[PDB]
Amino acid sequence: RKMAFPSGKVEGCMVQVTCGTTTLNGLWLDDVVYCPRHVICTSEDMLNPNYEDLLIRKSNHNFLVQAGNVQLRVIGHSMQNCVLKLKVDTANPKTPKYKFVRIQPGQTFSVLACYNGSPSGVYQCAMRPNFTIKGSFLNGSCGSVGFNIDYDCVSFCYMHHMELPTGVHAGTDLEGNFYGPFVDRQTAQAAGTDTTITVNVLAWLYAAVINGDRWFLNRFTTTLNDFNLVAMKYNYEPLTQDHVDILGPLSAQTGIAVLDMCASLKELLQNGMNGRTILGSALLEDEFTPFDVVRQCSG
Amino acid sequence: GFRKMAFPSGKVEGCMVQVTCGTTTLNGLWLDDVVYCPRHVICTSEDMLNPNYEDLLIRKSNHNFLVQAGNVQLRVIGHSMQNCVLKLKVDTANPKTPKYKFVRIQPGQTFSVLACYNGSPSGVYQCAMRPNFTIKGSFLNGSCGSVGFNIDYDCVSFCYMHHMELPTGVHAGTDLEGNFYGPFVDRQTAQAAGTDTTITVNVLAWLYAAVINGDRWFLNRFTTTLNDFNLVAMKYNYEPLTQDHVDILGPLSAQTGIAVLDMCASLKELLQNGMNGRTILGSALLEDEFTPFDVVRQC
Ligand SMILES: *[C@@H](O)[C@H](C[C@@H]1CCNC1=O)NC(=O)[C@H](CC(C)C)NC(=O)OC[C@H]1C[C@H]2C=CC[C@H](C2)C1
Ligand SMILES: *[C@@H](O)[C@H](C[C@@H]1CCNC1=O)NC(=O)[C@H](CC(C)C)NC(=O)OC[C@H]1C[C@H]2C=CC[C@H](C2)C1
């Protein structure tokens, strides 16, 4: 089951940011509010914005930052890649311990979908290999963030900026660098062909083994290079060394070597399921990370 | 986009505490100056095999209950039992108490679960009350006292408190008056549920969601009467569709231009032919834990 992180620590950081009649969400940490820089655009500006020129025309007093109906006075501003940073005169007393991280494809995170600075729902997303996410985002959702929580610390990894023709979503890290080859312009853009997240499928197979569903374990092994070359013919991602390493704990727990599991997956790709199921499904699941399998099979 | 989405959990996170009696620890819900929790906290492992709860409870004193909110012990100054829930009066009001109600939900209705361990929130997810009054949750040892809820405006409606897992892996619990959903008892003995059925009005909502998101492969030119649909639905262990259900689906029908009974004829075809390998909103199975309201809210 997809399980999100408890959202309270992030809810306490959500604000709204308005420039003119353009409103979206911002993230208030200490005395800085982070938000998408296209808040400075009119609808017509978005077709072909010159952000440097648009921002030179702005001053601190052109930005309306609100926590609910309570205005936070803006005392400084700057642009960092595709994010605006607004210094405000109040440090957020609900600021959690936090970090800004840039995630890899395959990593999952919780999204707190917000409208007008108000949280509406929380759900789990996986960053696809084509650097899109299958979100649920409507008009006004920009500036909603994705995050993971480890012990005390919220790791912010995603800020929402746009939807693509195919219905999927694109955005940046909290330094304003897009995931993928997208730009914050209201122009026709296309997500490239997606692929299956191999490291997560392997995590799912380990989860199946942990729960006693292990008919697919075969008697073979493989090399990582051989496996990578075969898997790409099935539109699966190649594994990295870091992938092998993050499967370590599940490999240790089950006693199944990573490359033996790779050989088992290879046989599933080459010969199919043959009518059988795994964890009550004939589809291989690729949106649970090794950490997610551990998270859920533990507490 | 369309995603299984939970309510933001912050208002509930600020109510979760840890309750300890003997070697038994679970979670409580702290509202104003009362902590609510499952009464089986008062049982030893031996007591749980066949507890006479009124007899066990009369023998406890206030100081037998250790309530911890974070690193802070709250002193218990009174205790009573309401059906299967224990109410501990404490000497401190929870300053984070939200506006709240206690409600008893109907089978087929959805809610969000905040899974907690040792009074600390661990994850949030969306559940439905099944027709057989189980829930397909993700609960581990120590999760008891986790609650299910819905949020409307500023108001949290608590509808579920977690008590147990069945041999089949599904879960059972009570409302906040301590009455179980279903024919279950808080005794450590193997218990089976009634035959489950599929929540038909929810499957139809999800099929409409799939259209709203541009997928209509499963539609057809046929139609059906309500009764002839219900004959087929019951044959496949689907719940009957009422005229209230038809009405409740009106907004989705209007939006998409697909009459409710036309979508019923679509579902009838899916039930009689299967999906022939295809998928809907990424699922190889018909999903029945989105209500019409859930779909509408998110679309
Ligand atoms: C937040 O400002 C907003 C969120 C999106 C609106 C609908 N769903 C979203 O996720 N972002 C934008 O409106 C964005 C601003 C540009 C400056 C980057 N543009 C955008 O997302 O365009 C998508 C629109 C327009 C058509 C194109 C593709 C999808 C769909 C039709 C919605
Ligand atoms: C909370 O105290 C705890 C939560 C469950 C533990 C495992 N998953 C849960 O949801 N509740 C209990 O342990 C409960 C106490 C009784 C007094 C009502 N009993 C229970 O849930 O039994 C199920 C356990 C024990 C074995 C029997 C069948 C299923 C499985 C093995 C889990």
Closest CA to A88 of A175, A168, A24, A26: A26
- Burial (CB count within 10 angstroms: exposed 0-12, middle 13-18, buried 19+), residue A64: middle
User: From start to end of B22-177, where are the E strands?
Assistant: 24-31, 34-38, 66-69, 72-74, 76-82, 85-90, 99-102, 110-117, 120-128, 147-152, 155-165, 171-174
Could you count the other beta carbons within 10 Å of the beta carbon of residue A126?
Answer: 21
Q: H/E element holding B265?
A: helix B260-273
**CA B142, CA B195: separation in Å to the nearest integer?**
28
**Chain CA centroid to CA B227, Å:** 30
A282 CB neighbours in chain B (<8 A) are: 284
Contact between A136 and B9 using a beta-carbon 8 Å cutoff = no
The CATH number of B200-298, from 3.40.50.2300, 1.10.1840.10, 3.90.180.10, 1.10.8.60, is: 1.10.1840.10
What three-state secondary structure class fits A226?
A: helix
Compute, in angstroms, the gap from residue A43 CA to the centroid of ligand 1: 11
Nearest CA in chain A to B8: A121
3-state DSSP assignment of residue A130: coil
Is residue B5 exposed (0-12), middle (13-18) or buried (19+ Cβ within 10 Å)? buried
For A142, the token pair is 């920009």
B285 lines ligand 2 (CB under 6 A): no
Cα pseudo-dihedral A15, A161, A165, A103, rounded to 10: -120
Solved with: X-ray
Max Cα separation, chain A?
69
The minimal CB distance from A4 to the residues B117, B123, B213 is found for B123
Is A82 tagged catalytic?
no
In short, whether A170's Cβ falls inside 6 Å of ligand 1 is no
- Tell me which amino acid residue B92 is: T
Which one, of A182, A157, A156, lies nearest residue A168 by Cα?
A: A182
DSSP letter string over A227-247?
HHHHHHHTTBPPPPHHHHHHT
Alpha helix locations (H) across B106-225?
A: 200-212
Whether A2 and B214 lie within 8 Å, measured CB to CB: no
**Partner residue facing A167 (CB), from B214, B284, B298:** B214
CA distance B293 to chain A (A): 14
**Side chain identity at residue B44, one-letter code:** T
Pocket residue to mutate for ligand 2, from B136, B163, B166, most atoms within 8 A of Cβ: B163
Element (H, E) at A77: strand A74-80
φ/ψ region of B108 (left if φ > 0, alpha if ψ in -120 to 50, else beta) reads: left
Tokens of A151: 């012990």
Tokens of A250: 């599940």
Check residue B70 and report its DSSP letter: T
Q: Which residues pair with B66 in a beta bridge?
A: B20
Q: Which two tokens stand for residue A15?
A: 């604000």
> Cα–Cα distances in Å, from A131 out to A169, A215, B208, B235?
9, 34, 28, 44
Q: How many CB atoms lie within 10 A of CB A196?
A: 17
Phi and psi for A271 in degrees, rounded to 5? Answer: -115, -10
Separation of alpha carbons B62 and B58, rounded Å: 11
Contacts of B72 (CB under 8 A, 6+ apart): none
Residue B216, burial from CB neighbour count under 10 angstroms (0-12, 13-18, 19+): middle
Q: Is the CB of A184 under 6 A from ligand 1?
A: yes
Tokens representing B31? 């509202």
Residues forming beta bridges with residue A123, ordered by sequence position? A111
Residue from A112, A156, A142 nearest A39 by CA: A142
Q: Are strands A97-100 and A83-88 parallel, antiparallel or unpaired?
A: unpaired
Enumerate the residues of chain A whose CB falls inside 8 A of the CB of residue B114.
6
Ligand 2 centroid to B23 CA: how many Å?
15
Q: How far apart are CA B219 and CA A246, in angstroms?
A: 43
Residue B166 in contact with residue B191, Cβ under 8 Å? Answer: yes
Task: Please state, in angstroms and rounded to a whole number, the distance separating the CA atoms of residues B277 and B118.
Answer: 43
Of all ligands present, the nearest one to the C-alpha of A23 is 1
The residue type at B180: F
- Non-local CB neighbours of B283 within 8 Å, separated by 6+ positions: none
Distance CA A266, CA B280 (A): 26
Q: Point out which residues pair with B192 in neighbouring strands.
A: none
User: Ligand 1, closest atom to CA A186?
Assistant: 16
- Report the distance separating Cα B199 and Cα B181, nearest Å: 17
Cα(A262)–Cα(A224) distance, rounded to whole angstroms? 8
CB-nearest to A3 from B11, B138, B214 is B138
What SS3 class is residue A96?
A: coil
Q: Could you tell me which chain B residue has the CA closest to the CA of A111?
A: B5
Give B168's contacts in chain A (Cβ within 8 Å): none
Structure tokens belonging to residue A37: 């820089």
Indicate the helix (H) or strand (E) that contains A19: strand A14-19
> How many angstroms away from the CA of A165 is the closest CA of chain B?
11
Cα radius of gyration rounded to whole Å, chain B = 22
Structure tokens that stand for A7 in this block:
């959202």
Could you give the C-alpha distances from A65 to A41, A158, A172, in angstroms and in order? 16, 21, 21
Indicate if ligand 1 lies below 6 Å from the C-beta of A116.
no
Distance CA A283, CA A269 (A): 11
Annotated catalytic, B40? yes
Q: Which residues of B14-53 are buried (b: 16+ CB within 10 A; e: fewer)?
A: bbbbbbbbeebbbbbbbbebbbbbbbbbbbeeebbeebeb
Is A299 in Cβ contact with B5 (below 8 Å)?
A: no
How far is C-alpha B122 from the geometric centre of its chain's CA atoms?
17
Residue located via tokens 């500036």: A143
Residue A280 CB-half CA count within 13 A: 3
Structure tokens at B144: 């008891």
Annotated catalytic residue: which of B43, B84, B116, B144? B144
Helices and strands of chain A, counted as H and E runs: 8, 13
Q: CB distance A122–B279 less than 8 Å? A: no
What is the topology classification, in CATH, of domain A198-297? main proteinase (3clpro) structure, domain 3 (1.10.1840)
Contacts of A134 in chain B (CB under 8 A): 1, 3, 282
Question: Looking at beta carbons, which residues of chain A come within 8 Å of B98?
Answer: none
Query: Quick check: A106 and A200 in contact, CB under 8 A?
Result: yes
Residue contact A136–B5, C-beta within 8 A? yes
Pick from A102, A101, A294: which is nearest to A200 by CA?
A294
